[PDB]
Design a protein around this ligand. Structure first.
Ligand SMILES: Nc1ncnc2c1ncn2[C@@H]1O[C@H](COP(=O)(O)OP(=O)(O)OP(O)(O)=S)[C@@H](O)[C@H]1O
Ligand SMILES: Nc1ncnc2c1ncn2[C@@H]1O[C@H](COP(=O)(O)OP(=O)(O)OP(O)(O)=S)[C@@H](O)[C@H]1O
Ligand SMILES: Nc1ncnc2c1ncn2[C@@H]1O[C@H](COP(=O)(O)OP(=O)(O)OP(O)(O)=S)[C@@H](O)[C@H]1O
Ligand SMILES: [K+]
Ligand SMILES: [K+]
Ligand SMILES: [K+]
Ligand SMILES: [K+]
Ligand SMILES: [Mg+2]
Ligand SMILES: [Mg+2]
Ligand SMILES: [Mg+2]
Ligand SMILES: [Mg+2]
Lengths: 525, 525, 525, 137
């Protein structure tokens, strides 16, 4: 269709207006004193939230160009979300701060490419500096502390997570399920988790977690691509009976077949979800087999002249439960017999012996760890279904936060970590004045999170920022009590991973907008 | 429908406005310092690109006359793209420069026909001069260098391409496929490539390459035209099973039958693609047979009273993979047995002996080369599916660039080649003044690429242009480092072929617009 | 529907405006220095052409009355096209010139009927004078020259045409087909051509020539009208097999049956084309038989109690190829055996002996000539399918032009012929002053072609016209070199037939418009 | 009072339009076959003339910029009139011819100062040549 095309300044003011509407709606929810945002629904009472992602998802603007700016920066939150699962609001205020001052510098005549280079250099050094200030979370005591703090001071949740990580290792798989009633339960079952998410949304039966969950499902392990539904018809019907859901783990499920699965499972006509097989090439087949040995299934490969049509419920694997995210599939408690599984382990164990290459050695050790590691399951205590469902949510969050903490450590929260990093880069310089302006744009933006947290408290941003900058180390502002103090001692911590991600994604998208010269969109008609 | 009709100047300003919108949106993406263009999408985040072709595809204007001018010059990019697979942005800025000054001259009262003639003469001489300045790329060391440079200094990709061309010759067929995992692979398989593209788009399943790709498909070799789908019904269904795609290599697939194929394969209902048989007349049948021998299929000609209805999956040929462009079909690794194939080679080999005419001799040698040459296959290394998919892209581009370099050599990049050529034509004259103006219009336009690259850097076009013209040889401006130097020593090269094509297509379309007196389009109703 | 009705002047200005938009869009393409016209398409790049007929086809106007004027004069081009196959643009500029001055005279109060009479008288005398100046093209040398000139100076095409006409006579049938590859081929086969075109478009499988072409088809020779498809069902299916197209040569194919044929052959469902049988009355049957004897078929007449239902593929005639225009059917190389054919010739040969009437004698001689003359076939050389298809086009045109040249000779091109004729009629007078004005309007219009050619060159019409008129004979202006000289010596010739047709049709349509008093069209609603 | 200010091309088209109205009205009266121009009067019958000066005096345009162009070229005729007392119409058609093509060249991107310099050189030499051709009286 005919297009509307805008260049330079005209495009720039539009983009800025768009990010401002999105960022302003989102940032009011930041921190302990975050304000509520009311989101209208077509039916019933409006949604009232303090969750940044919930607000961002609703934002769409009428002006086509302004809307592009909002959708672009919306990418910041989503990516930060996918990478760290927290700090999407922080990332959005950082992006708005960099974009605002960056576009001003552009309008002033400064070189966009140089501004971006300066911003990027500052971020590169800032991340290194962030790592230097990071405090490790390696021993179980630390893990327990972070867990407790993330569970609203519930030492119970802290001990649970610490024990779970002591079982399967801090790098191991850990899940949480409803409890049998009163008292928590922690047991390790035969399970595995690989990096492959659902082949499309819709499969998502629990939008609360934006994931797909199946109970006691059958697992089809096809070593090939599936384009024609015909091949599935025989097995899908065999699964239609026994009233159990089906998990498709094939090399890939293309359009035709996938489209059908999305439509049928959409009408309650058999619950089926598909995900790509882990790895690629040779190791792929070997890994597809590990899943079979674990779930007690049979790989259906064309290499041995096998057909999906000639596949019965006996070939299918099975597990008590499977969960899949946007990019992760976890099989909990497989039917496979410890004899077959443990044997498979022994095999791969020798593979490592005969390993003539570190790479092949690494890849093999990865499989044994997955197949021999299992999956720790945390069954949340109870005393009434309501409280149980609640504690479960806390455990889930605490667990998520502790996991991130374990990966990259923790830093002072309340935005002070970024403020401390900014002060350490006061002498950073680039190749020219425009690059230096870019550097300053970024260091200035690093104060935005703390400032917005203070603003939401109803206090003066410049005053608090000035005071915090006046001190050093973990000295910061506790927005809940409105008192200054040591952020670590007051238990206000952020996983270094979410702070780093919020900053990198904000800068990444800001850099793109700052160097955008033209925008194309459909004519408002 | 009622038409709007415009003449002379009225039409001219409309066209100019149209090419300016397109050229201006596209040209900001030129060179190492190209800026981003944001393209709106109906769903999700907008597309942010620095790729000229991506931008051009989106351009369509509201005013019908302005739109015509944009679509006309859009043909420049597309043709240059089809011919050299690069330099579409350069071609567009050259076209804008010629059109702008040429239309100005027309408005000044100069003769359009003479202007065009002068422009054409300049381009004709410029192309000859471009060839003179071209540096060959014949030995494997040169091929390796070009390949390395085109692969972002990846000496690995350079060696690969060099070795691949050393196997099948620099004029041989080369393909790249995903690797089995870590470490690259180079092996020659039984394959062939003929000059025939898809009988219509849509078949294109990979718009990234604007090509059609089929894996382990069946190949129907019908020696006749196919108009009625009825004939196909039996075979299409046989192919429906076995779950394999079908490649139709007939004399031609006309409307009725073709239309159906486009619709069915559009609905996932059996994946089928059709292309015309290579050559024409007698040799056609002989060649169609070479394909059969290679894929292990059976030609279904009416001459022997054979019907497509009475054709089973046993008659169909087969290969591990086939790729088809806008005008090229390549069959990779055919089922045919070396016995039959090598035997077929021997036959044609004697044919050359009994050859009583050079023409027939040439044609026969062409077949043997194709049937005996094979197809070099490059399997990209790995170490994680992500990196593997990435390196594969680099190898693809590097290969494409190197291939072009091998055909016509290389010249200084950054727009200096065209600038050196222009200076060498300062004394070029035509049959009259208007023709001389035409010549100058062209010579002036030849500076546009370098000027736009500099402009995108944020530097001063005239100053850099002036300085570069001041020197000579490969002296140029490195836009990445913003330093002057020897373009070749700095590794900034352009295949002579893409520079030549960009210039010729730009002049071609510009000459047509310059000599346009009337425009007809639908009334805006 | 309610109508809008206009009279006199009101209608006249509308008509004039309409012919002016059409004529102005078309005339810019006249001559060697013709300008391009861009025609918008719904998809892809617009069409850029210098072809008058392509431009005219697109012209439709919004104002209903203006549109009528455009569609009316559009009939000039089409009729001149159908009659001579060239000079449609020349015809259109002559028409605009006559209409413009004619309508001015009407507005000035002159009698429309007298104006028309005067224009008609001038044209009548002009055509006679044109025949007087016409130079013959009888000998093979002349034929070769005209052919060479018409083939863009390709002396090869010139020899071919000359040889082809030397074989079957300059009045004989000649066709051109794709070559076998390199080197031209000329062979006389058993063929025939009669004056009957397709019974409707659509059958046209090659819009490039706007004709229908069938290869090795079956020929149904039904001596009666065909209204019900039922009769055909049996034979159509018999032809469904053997995979061969069918040519229906019946007394006529009416609605019901014809409509079906158009729809089925439209869906690839059997390729069939229908044309009326040559002649009428008695001779018709006798001729329909000549076709049978030639194609080896059997006439299915109801006179002998024969039914189309009881007709097998054995009754149908057959030939290697048949081509049918808007009003011509040519059967190339029929299956008929020289025994039957030559015998048939002997029969008709005696018929001429027993002829008691010149008319019957003439009609009989016509049949023997057609049945005994055959068809010279020209197979264009090759060396790549592309060049072959191109040269074929040139030979086609060169042949078409030479044919016309042979019929009425040639005259000086560049519009000097009409200029010479006009000057010879300077004393022509009519019955009254108004008729004299009509005469002058026509003589004046005769200068229009030369003037427009010069105008498209960018030169001054009045200066060149004045100079050409100053000389005499073949003295004219060479628009390609912009030099005066002898048009004949410079090889700038026009078939007298196209010049005569352009003038007569232009005057014809102009006379109708000049004598139109009222216009009726639908209300713009 | 507040002013309207125009630059380059915008100004050029306005001027050209203004001189064209004046020149076109004036030049129809040139030579033995000059045509009549009717000039309205507030009272009585209009003035019918073939005299260029009479026509030029009446020309004033509504658009302020176009009017400036007319008044400027009007200076040509008056000065030629004061200097030689004849040829004001000839001076006006020469002015329009130079202005028209000169402005076209400017719009084509040619240097205004150089165009003027060239025109000046041609006139300087043309005047010398005119003296050579001149027959004494
Ligand atoms: N008492 C406190 N004083 C100051 N800052 C605090 C306090 N408690 C938490 N925070 C900080 O508030 C920020 C987190 O606020 P949230 O509202 O959860 O936003 P976000 O994590 O950036 O984005 P969401 O949660 O994905 S929307 C972190 O910087 C915390 O350190
Ligand atoms: N460091 C450099 N300095 C100067 N010019 C460079 C440099 N690197 C690449 N170039 C030139 O930039 C041009 C290629 O830029 P691109 O943006 O890829 O446009 P294009 O190839 O003309 O069109 P696309 O790629 O089809 S959009 C060529 O003229 C290169 O020689
Ligand atoms: N060198 C030449 N000098 C002058 N007239 C020429 C020359 N070459 C061709 N012509 C004339 O150009 C006319 C033919 O021009 P075309 O553009 O083909 O138009 P047309 O044949 O009148 O109509 P079309 O072709 O059906 S659109 C004839 O009058 C030719 O004699
Ligand atoms: K919040
Ligand atoms: K680019
Ligand atoms: K033409
Ligand atoms: K006068
Ligand atoms: Mg949070
Ligand atoms: Mg490029
Ligand atoms: Mg013609
Ligand atoms: Mg005087």
């Amino acid at each position: 269709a005919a297009k509307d095309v805008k260049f330079g300044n005209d495009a720039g003011v539009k983009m800025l207006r768009g990010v401002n509407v999105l960022a302003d709606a989102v940032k009011v929810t930041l921190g302990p004193k975050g304000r509520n945002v009311v989101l209208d629904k077509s039916f019933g009472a409006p949604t009232i939230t303090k969750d940044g992602v919930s607000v961002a998802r609703e934002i769409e603007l009428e002006d086509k160009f302004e809307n592009m700016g909002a959708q672009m920066v919306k990418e910041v939150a989503s990516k930060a979300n996918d990478a760290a699962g927290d700090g999407t609001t922080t990332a959005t205020v950082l992006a708005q701060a960099i974009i605002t001052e960056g576009l001003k510098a552009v309008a002033a005549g400064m070189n966009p490419m140089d501004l971006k280079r300066g911003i990027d250099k500052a971020v590169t050094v800032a991340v290194e500096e962030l790592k230097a200030l990071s405090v490790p979370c390696s021993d179980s005591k630390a893990i327990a502390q972070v867990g407790t703090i993330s569970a609203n001071s519930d030492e119970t949740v802290g001990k649970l997570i610490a024990e779970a990580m002591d079982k399967v290792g801090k790098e191991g798989v850990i899940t949480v399920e409803d409890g049998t009633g009163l008292q928590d339960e922690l047991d390790v079952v035969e399970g595995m988790q690989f990096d492959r998410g659902y082949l499309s949304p819709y499969f998502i039966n629990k939008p609360e977690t934006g994931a797909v969950e199946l109970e006691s499902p059958f697992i089809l392990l096809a070593d090939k691509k599936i384009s024609n539904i015909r091949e599935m018809l025989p097995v899908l019907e065999a699964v239609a009976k026994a009233g159990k859901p089906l998990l498709i783990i094939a090399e890939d499920v293309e359009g035709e077949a996938l489209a059908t699965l999305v439509v049928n499972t959409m009408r309650g006509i058999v619950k089926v979800a598909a995900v790509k097989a882990p790895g690629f090439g040779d190791r792929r087949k070997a890994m597809l087999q590990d899943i079979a040995t674990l779930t007690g299934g049979t790989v259906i490969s064309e290499e041995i002249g096998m057909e999906l049509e000639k596949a019965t419920l006996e070939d299918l694997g099975q597990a008590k439960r499977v969960v899949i995210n946007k990019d992760t599939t976890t099989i909990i408690d497989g039917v496979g017999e410890e004899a077959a599984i443990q044997g498979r382990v022994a095999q791969i164990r020798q593979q490592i012996e005969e390993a003539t290459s570190d790479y092949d050695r690494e890849k093999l050790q990865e499989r044994v760890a997955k197949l021999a590691g299992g999956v720790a399951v945390i069954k949340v205590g109870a005393a009434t279904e309501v409280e149980m469902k609640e504690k479960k949510a806390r455990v889930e969050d605490a667990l998520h936060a502790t996991r991130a903490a374990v990966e990259e450590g923790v830093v002072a929260g309340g935005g002070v970590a970024l403020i401390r990093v900014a002060s350490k880069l006061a002498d950073l310089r680039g190749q020219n004045a425009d690059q230096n302006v870019g550097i300053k744009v970024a260091l200035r933006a690093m104060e935005a999170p703390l400032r917005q947290i203070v603003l939401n408290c109803g206090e003066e941003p410049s005053v608090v920022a000035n005071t915090v900058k006046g001190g050093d180390g973990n000295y910061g502002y506790n927005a809940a009590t409105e008192e200054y103090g040591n952020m670590i001692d007051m238990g206000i911590l952020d996983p270094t991973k979410v702070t780093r991600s919020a900053l990198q994604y904000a800068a990444s998208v800001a850099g793109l907008m700052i160097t955008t010269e033209c925008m194309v969109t459909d004519l408002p008609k």
